[PDB]
Amino acid sequence: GMKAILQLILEKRQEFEKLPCFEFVRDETISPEERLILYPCIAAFALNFRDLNRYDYRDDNSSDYYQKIINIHTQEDAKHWEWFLNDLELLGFDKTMRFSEALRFVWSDDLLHTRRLCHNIAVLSHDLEPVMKMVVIEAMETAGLVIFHALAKPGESIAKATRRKYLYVADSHVEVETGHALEQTQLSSEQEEKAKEIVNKVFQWSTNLIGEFERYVKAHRSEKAQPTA
Amino acid sequence: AGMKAILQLILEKRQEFEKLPCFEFVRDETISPEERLILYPCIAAFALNFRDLNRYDYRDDSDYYQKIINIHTQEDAKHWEWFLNDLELLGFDKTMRFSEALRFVWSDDLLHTRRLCHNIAVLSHDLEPVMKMVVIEAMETAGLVIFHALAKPGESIAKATRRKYLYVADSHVEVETGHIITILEQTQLSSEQEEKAKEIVNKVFQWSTNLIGEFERYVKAHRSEKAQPTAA
Ligand SMILES: N[C@@H](Cc1c[nH]c2ccc(Br)cc12)C(=O)O
Ligand SMILES: N[C@@H](Cc1c[nH]c2ccc(Br)cc12)C(=O)O
Ligand SMILES: [Fe+2]
Ligand SMILES: [Fe+2]
Ligand SMILES: [Fe+2]
Ligand SMILES: [Fe+2]
Ligand code: NI
């Protein structure tokens, strides 16, 4: 029911768009430096997402038409972790700390959902046939696009004011993810119900992650980005 | 015959695993223990993931076999703090940029170390509690071998500096000796469960073998970065 599945992704996307967090990130009455205090939280996700694309999504030896399309997709997505580290530096969040402080931060109970999003997608897709992996990926990329559409607003305000090139919370990342977020497909009967479960899970896990970002902003509300012009 | 054969394949695997070159180096009392513990920070890529594997993947907060796993997982989910304890004592809790910390953990040279717990979680997500216990037994058997070896340079530094190490330490090995086969031994299983437990034991030992391979490669790459413990 590829029309239904996509219709569900569209419906889920329309709910995801309205989470409080994105209301806050899109609010031009608040300094862009404060709207980006969630940024160091993505550390629990960005490099795990690199690994999901490199080691879980990708099966380089496949003749499957859907798998080949996934493979090209994974090539692009697996480079964005360096963009994350680029803007971590620009935003003043790449602070000197003890090795153990870094580990305790990434493995915080407060970042459980952020850290385990890629893990859950790994467990969810490890036995799926290529066409079903594409539903997983399309759901996940739709949620990614919503988040980066939001983050790119305070990101580009800082970039222009400081005259620096941002790569991660920036229109150029939204541009690549736009192409990523085919339709000539008819799913077996129980596949359609499988795909509905995929879409519900990816969006539920994505919601839980934004949940933690909101909580972290609350709890670390003075810890605003410190970019330099 | 089934479970008799399975616990026997684990002993075969343990005796094979014990002979890897990394363990010859770690046990070698002619090398300074500070040099043998060059590989210690590599465990950063595994130790907090293993905590999460115990808290979230193995553990399930009425089947009698899950109930025993949960008391098992409860205890293992505490050893990550011991890791951070010894990280400091060895002089490996150094000040660095947050990004240097992230690039360390996600290094391509710590891939197998980093994905061991990932692989175990994926293998065991859809197993009956009996087969989870197989996974846990194989994995704990690999652990005891590693910590028997590391506790040697470990206890040498602890005595020479007079400090309580908790991770590369007999006190860790002793708790882990406790870790049960005695309920596993009093279990029967199918031609299916037979073939599956065989698949499990092989993968847990191959993945642990790959992790040890990366430790050996690290030591050779970073031969100058030996531990710098402080005496009391
Ligand atoms: N465009 C993202 C990938 C992404 C895809 N889906 C996501 C969901 C939540 C978060 Br945070 C990130 C993503 C990246 O480049 O790391
Ligand atoms: N006793 C270990 C658990 C462990 C169990 N199996 C392991 C295999 C490789 C390594 Br490194 C560690 C383990 C711990 O406390 O982290
Ligand atoms: Fe991206
Ligand atoms: Fe993408
Ligand atoms: Fe342990
Ligand atoms: Fe244990
Ligand atoms: Ni499965």
Domain ranges of chain A: 2-219
Cα gap B7→B13, rounded to integer Å: 10
How many Å from the N-terminal Cα to the C-terminal Cα in chain A?
51
Retrieve residue B133's tokens: 């216990």
Instruction: Give the C-alpha separation, B231 to B24, whole Å.
Output: 27
Question: To which residue do tokens 């470990």 refer?
Answer: B154
HEC string for chain A: CHHHHHHHHHHHHHHHCCCHHHHHHCCCCCCHHHHCCCHHHHHHCHHHHHHHHHHHHCCCCCCCHHHHHHHHHHHHHCCHHHHHHHHHHHCCCCCEEEHHHHHHHHCCHHHHHHHHHHHHHHHHHCCCCHHHHHHHHHHHHHHHHHHHHHHHHHHHHHHHHHCCCCCCCCHHHHHHHHHHCCCCCCCCHHHHHHHHHHHHHHHHHHHHHHHHHHHHHHHCCCCCCCCCC
* One-letter amino acid of B58: Y
The CA B213 to ligand 5 mean position distance, Å, reads 20
Dist CA A15 CA B180 (whole Å): 47
Q: Residue A140, Cα to own-chain centre: how many angstroms? A: 7
Name the one residue in this structure whose structure tokens are 């799913």: A187
DSSP, residue by residue, B46-102: HHHHHHHIIIIII-----HHHHHHHHHHHHHTTHHHHHHHHHHHTT---EEEHHHHH
Q: B17, B50, B72, B170: which to mutate for ligand 2, most atoms within 8 A of CB? A: B50
Kindly report the protein residue whose alpha carbon is nearest to atom 6 of ligand 2. Answer: B143
* Pairwise CA distance, residues A155 & A79, whole Å: 19
The encoded tokens of residue B104 equal 């360390």
Residues of chain B with Cβ-Cβ distance to A96 below 8 Å are: 95-97
Look at the block and give the residue holding tokens 């717990």: B117
| Tokens 């991660």, residue located | A168
Dig out the tokens for A227 from the structure.
């970019």
- Residues A32, A155 contacting (CB under 8 angstroms): yes
The C-alpha of A97 sits at a distance from chain B's nearest C-alpha, in angstroms, of: 5
Which CATH code of 3.40.718.10, 1.20.910.10, 1.20.140.10, 1.10.150.20 fits the domain covering B3-221?
Answer: 1.20.910.10
HSE-CB of B1 using CA atoms within 13 angstroms: 3
**How far apart, in whole angstroms, are the C-alpha atoms of residue B142 and residue B120?**
13
Residues with CB under 6 A from ligand 1: A 42, 45-46, 49, 80, 140-141, 143-144, 147-148, 177, 206, 209
SS3 content of chain B, % helix, strand, coil (to 5): 75, 0, 25
Closest-CA residue to B97 (of A154, A155, A141, A88): A88
Neighboring chain B residues of A107 at a CB cutoff of 8 Å? 48, 51-52, 80
User: How many whole angstroms separate alpha carbon B202 and alpha carbon B214?
Assistant: 19
Exposure string (b/e) for A19-40, b if CB count within 10 Å is 16 or more? Answer: bebbebbeeeeeebbbbbbbbb
What radius of gyration, in Å, describes the C-alpha atoms of chain B?
18
Contacts of B39 (CB under 8 A, 6+ apart): B22, B26, B215, B216, B218, B219
Residue B5 Cα to ligand 1 midpoint, Å, equals 46
* Domain topology for A2-219: Heme Oxygenase; Chain A (1.20.910)
Residue B69: count other Cβ atoms within 10 Å of its Cβ.
19
How far is it, in rounded angstroms, from Cα B224 to Cα A40?
Answer: 32
- Kindly state the tokens that stand for B214: 């990366």
Dihedral in degrees, nearest 10, Cα atoms B54, A136, B99, B146: 30
Q: How many CB atoms lie within 10 A of CB B20?
A: 19
CA of B104 to the centre of ligand 6 (A): 26
Considering every ligand atom shown, identify the ligand nearest to the alpha carbon of residue B135 and give its number: 2
- Of the candidates B125, B132, B114, the one whose C-alpha atom is nearest the C-alpha of residue A125 is B125
What dihedral angle (degrees, nearest 10) is formed by the CA atoms of A84, A90, A96, A100?
A: -20
Query: From which experimental method does this structure derive?
Result: X-ray
